[PDB]
């Protein structure tokens with residue numbers, strides 16, 4: 001599913017991501033924009049052989065099981081395929097664990113490089129929330 005911008009903001013809020021660990025909704029929408037362009041089915045293969053999955057490009061090295069990332073963990077206790085669903089529940093619940101791991105949203109390098117320090121409120125501007 002490719003979400004609309006406000007549609008995704010609303011879904012993220014519904015699932016308790018708004019201001020989670022102090023990160024406003026615009027941060028999360030911005031991260032999703034640059035990670036996946038709002039496409040739940042996004043996948044990308046990393047140089048280390050791991051894969052990133054879903055709207056927030058969650059990585060199989062630590063967070064989910066895909067059966068093909070040697071030496072990896074599955075800390076969200078989910079198959080990576082669950083992160084591709086039109087229902088963002090699994091991605092949100094896993095993101096909550098990731099952002100709580102110590103480095104906040106810096107875990108998403110694209111958030112650090114493209115969202116951090118910017119006017120992230122622009123991502124939810126106009127949205128009925």
Ligand SMILES: [Cl-]
Pocket residue numbers: 024025026027120121122124
């Ligand atoms: Cl915001």
Ligand SMILES: [Cl-]
Pocket residue numbers: 065066067068069070071072
């Ligand atoms: Cl594996």
Ligand SMILES: [Cl-]
Pocket residue numbers: 109110113114
């Ligand atoms: Cl980047």
